[PDB]
Design a protein around this nucleic acid. Structure first.
Lengths: 158, 22, 55, 22, 184, 146, 85, 260, 50
RNA sequence: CAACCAUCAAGCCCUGGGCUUGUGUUGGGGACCCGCGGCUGCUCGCGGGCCCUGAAAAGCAGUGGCGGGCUCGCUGGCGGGUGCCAGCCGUAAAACCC
């Protein structure tokens, strides 16, 4: 699931600064000597949470290692109540490499072009079944309890 | 100046063209 | 997402068991004002009702 | 026998779910 | 450890390759080239991990197994059929005179008694061939460029050329010259 | 020795017979396999049943492969409970399901000529069905002379 | 630091930024010319064109060796071609 | 073949079609989107050809076209979808320039093969396009590519299949398409739009469209007679030696026989 | 008393069908970008000045 | 888990229009209509027509063989089997391979 999502996200990765300035110069020279809405992955905590609140998001990806963790605690729950499918991937580094940055907290897919309606819907269904139900049966509990041998002996002696 | 087509066919030393005055 | 404080959970247990007077007294002792105690009992009561509906 | 089969099946599941690289 | 994506991809590759091979086998082996025999140098590139039996035997005849192998060949009817059969794995075209000269001079090895010795000595060249009309490495070069009756023997004697792997440098008539300086 | 039966549905095209064999054997020993196909035209109908030697490794494969996106197909690999396990689930296991060109044969029995007795039998059948056709078509208001 | 940056680009998958990074690199595999500018050091080494002619012995011998020799990873075919020219 | 019996059979079958259409549907329960006149109309009457041997030859199996004296196509409200090899932009430019009367009105969409492969690879997408458009045209350079880009539900199942056209005058697609000129393109397209399609099946039975019941019996008789001559003379192997039964059939009723 | 209890999704059990904000969408989300328009104009100025 | 058929060919007629050889397509279901093969027959196959269908899903797998492989014996040779072949064809046998 991570790999397929990364494939689609890479096919929709945002334009970098070099090629953005290049296309701006393209347009300027065209003015010297016709397009549709750009579809690109939306990034940014506040932007994505507002998009989810307005139900403009089709899929939500959440970094698992946001070192202020409060920035995310409410995000899976708000996604669940809103209805937008959500998943939690390993690496704010991969989020920041999907975008052309060092790190990103959340990644949203809202709308894509015609050619990949099918694979967008298929990825949405795949996640909302095979990760959503799997971690939905068991997510209302408390984790931990990984005591080792020395921990067991110490607790027995205590 | 040396010409690429003749060099490719195998001119070698003959490929280069020398002009006494600039 | 956050849950309940220890005293909030204590008052929740009291209200579920039916000791409304005891819950109100405990809330007053923890908060310091009758109005705040009444209000907190109110949110906790709608939380209990919403949990019952959800179940 | 049975333990070895279980171990190899668990290894295959781990390889399929997490990869082999590192 | 190997995965279902690879299983499916390999099976589809095999299926499509089998379909295309059957297509050529059923169709007439007539290429849009004049009936004259030509000279074409062919370099094989790793396209598919697993190869069907007919392309495998063709590659066996063309001795192109070790990585980055190339060899000269006569463009005729049967050879064109074999090339069209092995099309995905081979990249081929007309060599240049400078290209063949540089190839033979930089990378030249002689096959004697199942041994691969470099073309250091015309004495070795003649102790190998001797009586067929070859007199030196330049004689072999001229034979290869202007094919003679001894072309098959010359091709058998010369070891297949092992081109260096390039770092980024169907049929095309002429760009094989650029590719041969790229891998040379 | 309790074998484990696992049913795999929503098979992507081509992940069929030696593909299931190889991948599920790379998990562990497979005793039987059968991907069901269509007798009319040789082609899998996208579901299969496999039988592992051990129900435990069957369970492992089931949970590790159950929800798996492969080539746009979300496979469904779930353990067939031992209670049902129909006896004839692997009647055609381990054997080809060959592509039989029934259309080609049918055309070729048509193209072989027949004997005179067979011809007159065909004539009798054809004239009987001509009479039936005339009977059912008269109510429309048409009568063909021939 | 520039190979560090091109490794940055290759690891992140930014093919276009990697292309500009190698453009700035001007690597002597496509270049055929020296990767570095040695004009100042050759000036310091050879105060006179007479000394340049004196070292032309090894210069010409070794470059003709390289004109004859085939290419390897360290010595690209392009730079051998330039030596031949 | 006898035109008097052909005409009377077509008259009787068409009359039965009107009676069947006028007969109320038994549940005492009516429709919105079908007035009685339109219910009688848009009903295909066709002819099925049954022969005596298997039709093995590949380009006998290949779809062909026949110039029918009255255009088989209604040209009333249907949409035709055309498939282009290269500059999509150029062919939209051409349809925007050339002819406003009928080509604007019947050409609903036109798609380059690259855009078709990119936008319609989903079974849902191909089925939706099949339902959306009414008849299809494509260039001979694209006909052989269609079976893989468009699935069985588009090609194998229904007679609603693309008709080959020639966008050939006698590589970089941005540079220049190699196409024959626009008015003659329009002529080829009108021929294809009105040109009855013939698809042959490997077995000994095939079905060919001949017309719609709302026409008149003499038009139907002339059209079917020309269809018979063209089929018997151009496509079927062993022209008069393999020939057999022709049945004139309506939408849901029986068929009327003629023997050859 | 169970110390660490399972959380009951009393509020999130109900999926909300509708977006939160009724504020009308501004024109900028349906018209092209004047920010890039001004940037293109500045680049044209720079090109004209050379 | 990329893309990768001829993004036009070759041959013809009556030289200017075309024609011809260029095989390729998910799987199901409907208490709907038709044609041909068989079945004494119900019916079953093949081919159509009209609909429903996320690239959907719970045995029903049935028709004859060539070679090849794994075998059982007699003398590397010969004769019977095979829910074996990522090989072929269609009733024969050949082809392929080495």
């Amino acid at each position: 699931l991570a790999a397929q999502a990364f494939k689609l996200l890479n096919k929709y990765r945002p334009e970098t600064k070099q090629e953005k300035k290049e296309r701006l110069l393209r347009e300027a020279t065209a003015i010297k000597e016709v397009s549709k809405k750009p579809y690109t992955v939306k990034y940014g905590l506040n932007h994505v949470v507002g998009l989810i609140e307005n139900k403009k998001a089709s899929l939500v990806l959440i970094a698992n290692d946001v070192d202020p963790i409060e920035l995310v605690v409410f995000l899976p729950a708000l996604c669940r109540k809103m209805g937008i499918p959500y998943a939690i991937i390993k690496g704010k580094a991969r989020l920041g490499t999907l975008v052309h940055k060092k790190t990103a907290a959340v990644v949203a897919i809202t709308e894509v072009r015609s050619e990949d309606k099918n694979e967008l819907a298929k990825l949405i269904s795949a996640v909302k079944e095979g990760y959503l139900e799997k971690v939905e049966d068991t997510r209302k509990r408390w984790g931990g309890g990984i005591m080792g041998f020395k921990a067991q002996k110490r607790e027995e002696k205590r | 100046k040396f010409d690429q087509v003749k060099d490719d066919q195998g001119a070698e030393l003959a490929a280069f063209s020398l002009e006494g005055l600039n | 997402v956050a849950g309940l404080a220890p005293y909030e959970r204590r008052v929740i247990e009291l209200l579920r068991n039916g000791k409304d007077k005891r819950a109100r007294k405990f809330s007053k002792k923890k908060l310091g004002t009758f109005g705040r105690a009444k209000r907190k009992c109110e949110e906790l009561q709608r939380i209990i009702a919403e949990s019952r509906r959800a179940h | 026998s049975k333990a070895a089969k279980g171990a190899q099946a668990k290894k295959a599941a781990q390889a399929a779910l997490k990869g082999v690289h590192s | 450890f190997k995965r279902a994506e690879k299983y499916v991809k390999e099976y589809r590759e095999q299926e499509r390759e089998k379909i295309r091979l059957a297509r050529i086998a059923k169709q007439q082996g007539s290429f849009h080239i004049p009936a004259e025999a030509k000279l074409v140098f062919v370099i094989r590139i790793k396209g598919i991990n697993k190869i069907p039996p007919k392309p495998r035997k063709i590659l066996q005849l063309l001795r192109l197994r070790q990585i980055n192998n190339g060899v000269f060949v006569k463009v005729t009817k049967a050879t064109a059929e074999m090339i069209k059969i092995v099309e995905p794995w081979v990249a081929y075209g007309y060599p240049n005179l400078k290209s063949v000269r540089e190839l033979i001079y930089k990378r030249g090895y002689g096959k004697v008694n199942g041994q691969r010795i470099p073309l250091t000595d015309n004495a070795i060249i003649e102790e190998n061939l001797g009586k067929y009309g070859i007199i030196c490495i330049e004689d072999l070069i001229h034979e290869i460029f202007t094919v003679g009756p001894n072309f098959k023997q010359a091709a058998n004697f010369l070891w297949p050329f092992k081109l260096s792997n390039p770092n980024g440098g169907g049929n095309r008539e002429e760009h094989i010259n650029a590719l041969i300086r790229a891998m040379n | 020795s309790q074998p484990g039966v696992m049913y795999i549905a929503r098979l992507p095209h081509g992940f069929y017979e030696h593909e299931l064999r190889g991948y599920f054997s790379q998990f562990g020993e497979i005793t039987r396999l059968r991907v069901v196909r269509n007798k009319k035209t040789g082609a899998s109908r996208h579901r299969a049943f496999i039988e592992f030697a051990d129900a435990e490794v069957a369970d492992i494969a089931a949970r590790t492969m159950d929800k798996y996106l492969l080539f746009g197909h979300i496979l469904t690999c779930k353990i067939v409970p031992p209670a049902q396990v129909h006896p004839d689930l692997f009647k055609g296991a381990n054997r080809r399901f060959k592509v039989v060109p029934w259309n080609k044969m049918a055309g070729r029995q048509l193209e072989r000529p027949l004997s005179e007795s067979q011809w007159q039998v065909k004539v009798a059948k054809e004239e009987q069905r001509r009479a039936a056709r005339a009977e059912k078509l008269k109510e429309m208001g048409y009568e063909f002379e021939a | 630091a520039l190979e560090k940056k091109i490794s940055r680009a290759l690891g992140r998958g930014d093919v276009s930024n990697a292309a500009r990074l190698e453009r700035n690199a001007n690597l002597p595999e496509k270049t055929g010319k020296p990767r570095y500018t040695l004009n100042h050091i050759i000036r310091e080494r050879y105060p006179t064109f007479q000394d340049a002619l004196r070292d032309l012995d090894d210069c010409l011998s070794m470059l003709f060796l390289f004109a004859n020799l085939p290419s390897t990873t360290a010595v690209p075919a392009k730079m051998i071609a330039r030596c031949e020219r | 073949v006898d035109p008097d019996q052909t005409l009377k059979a077509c008259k009787a079958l068409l009359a039965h079609i009107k009676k069947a259409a006028a007969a109320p549907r038994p549940d005492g329960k009516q429709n919105l989107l079908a007035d009685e006149e339109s219910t009688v109309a848009e009903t295909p009457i066709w002819l099925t050809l049954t022969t005596k041997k298997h039709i093995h030859d590949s380009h006998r199996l290949q779809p062909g076209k026949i110039i029918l004296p009255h255009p088989l196509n209604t040209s009333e409200e249907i949409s035709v979808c055309l498939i282009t090899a290269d500059p999509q932009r150029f062919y939209k430019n051409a349809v925007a320039d050339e002819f406003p009367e009928d080509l604007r009105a019947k050409i609903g969409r036109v798609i380059d093969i690259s855009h078709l492969k990119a936008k319609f690879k989903a079974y849902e997408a191909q089925r939706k396009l099949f339902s959306e458009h009414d008849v299809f045209l494509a260039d001979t350079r694209i006909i052989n590519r269609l079976p893989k880009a468009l699935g069985k539900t588009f090609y194998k199942t229904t007679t609603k299949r693309p008709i080959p056209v020639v966008l050939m005058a006698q590589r970089d697609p941005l540079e220049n398409a190699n196409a024959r000129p626009i008015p003659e393109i329009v002529a080829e397209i009108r021929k294809a739009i009105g040109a009855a399609l013939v698809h042959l099946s490997p077995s000994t039975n095939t079905a060919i469209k001949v017309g719609y019941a709302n026409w008149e019996p003499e038009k139907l008789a002339a059209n079917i007679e020309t269809v018979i001559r063209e089929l018997v003379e151009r496509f079927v192997p062993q022209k008069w030696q393999n020939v057999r039964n022709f049945y004139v059939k309506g939408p849901e009723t029986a068929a009327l026989p003629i023997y050859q | 008393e169970d110390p660490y209890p399972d959380t009951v999704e009393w509020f999130t059990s109900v999926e909300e069908k509708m977006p939160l904000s009724a504020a009308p969408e501004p024109k900028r989300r349906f018209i092209p970008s004047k920010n890039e328009a001004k940037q293109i104009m500045k680049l044209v100025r720079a090109i004209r000045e050379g």
